[PDB]
Design a protein around this motif. Structure first.
Motif, mmCIF file in Angstrom:
data_model
loop_
_atom_site.group_PDB
_atom_site.id
_atom_site.type_symbol
_atom_site.label_atom_id
_atom_site.label_comp_id
_atom_site.label_asym_id
_atom_site.label_seq_id
_atom_site.Cartn_x
_atom_site.Cartn_y
_atom_site.Cartn_z
ATOM 1 N N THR A 145 0.851 -1.183 0.000
ATOM 2 C CA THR A 145 0.000 0.000 0.000
ATOM 3 C C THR A 145 0.888 1.235 0.000
ATOM 4 O O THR A 145 1.763 1.373 0.862
ATOM 5 C CB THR A 145 -0.935 0.011 1.210
ATOM 6 N N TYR A 146 0.663 2.128 -0.959
ATOM 7 C CA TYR A 146 1.519 3.289 -1.178
ATOM 8 C C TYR A 146 0.747 4.556 -0.823
ATOM 9 O O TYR A 146 -0.140 4.974 -1.573
ATOM 10 C CB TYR A 146 2.002 3.332 -2.625
ATOM 11 N N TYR A 147 1.096 5.165 0.308
ATOM 12 C CA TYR A 147 0.494 6.418 0.760
ATOM 13 C C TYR A 147 1.238 6.880 2.009
ATOM 14 O O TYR A 147 2.140 6.198 2.506
ATOM 15 C CB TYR A 147 -1.001 6.259 1.047
ATOM 16 N N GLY A 148 0.849 8.049 2.512
ATOM 17 C CA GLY A 148 1.246 8.468 3.842
ATOM 18 C C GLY A 148 2.571 9.188 3.998
ATOM 19 O O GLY A 148 3.451 8.689 4.700
ATOM 20 N N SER A 149 2.736 10.340 3.340
ATOM 21 C CA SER A 149 3.846 11.262 3.584
ATOM 22 C C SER A 149 5.175 10.707 3.075
ATOM 23 O O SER A 149 5.326 9.488 2.928
ATOM 24 C CB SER A 149 3.941 11.597 5.078
ATOM 25 N N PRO A 150 6.156 11.571 2.781
ATOM 26 C CA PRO A 150 7.408 11.075 2.179
ATOM 27 C C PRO A 150 8.173 10.075 3.032
ATOM 28 O O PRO A 150 8.781 9.150 2.480
ATOM 29 C CB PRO A 150 8.220 12.362 1.961
ATOM 30 N N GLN A 151 8.164 10.228 4.358
ATOM 31 C CA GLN A 151 9.032 9.426 5.216
ATOM 32 C C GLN A 151 8.736 7.933 5.119
ATOM 33 O O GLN A 151 9.569 7.157 4.633
ATOM 34 C CB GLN A 151 8.914 9.884 6.671
ATOM 35 N N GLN A 152 7.551 7.513 5.563
ATOM 36 C CA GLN A 152 7.250 6.089 5.525
ATOM 37 C C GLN A 152 6.946 5.594 4.118
ATOM 38 O O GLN A 152 7.029 4.391 3.879
ATOM 39 C CB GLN A 152 6.097 5.748 6.474
#
Length: 49
Positions: A42-49
């Motif tokens: 799953t690809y989402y949630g801010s650059p870091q994670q």
DNA sequence: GACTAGGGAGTAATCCCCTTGGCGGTTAAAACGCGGGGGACAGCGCGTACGTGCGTTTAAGCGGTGCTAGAGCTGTCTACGACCAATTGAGCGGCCTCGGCACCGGGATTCTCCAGGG
């Protein structure tokens, strides 16, 4: 269809599921309840994670 | 000489692509707040390095001089630079690549923190 491609054929390389944001979780749950022999990302949630 | 035939412009209908506003969705940068700690700065002591008074001399200003070689202006000419255009090529205006740049991943490498003992 993907399960048949992975079973009949030895090819189950990286495939892409382009979906709207709202169903983003549902898809990764859709075959979590259903056929779980695949490795889902799953690809989402801010650059870091 | 009277009227006839055909085609690009005059008039007009079709298309249709191009944008004016508003509004919603979603990521990224900006906005705000806390624990704690390292940077700012006071209080102070001192020593030693200048701040200052006075003796004893070299030196710039003083006062003047006798000129001497470089600087300003007087002709004077003549080598040269700003006056037309043919040119014709040095170079720019517009297009078409594939390659170096853009940029991210796997890994080796390296830079930093700690809680303990050593």
């Amino acid at each position: 269809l993907l399960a048949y491609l992975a079973c009949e054929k030895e090819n189950w390389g990286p495939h892409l599921i382009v979906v709207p944001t709202s169903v983003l979780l549902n898809w990764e749950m859709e075959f979590k309840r259903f056929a779980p022999g695949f490795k889902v990302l799953t690809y989402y949630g801010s650059p870091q994670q």
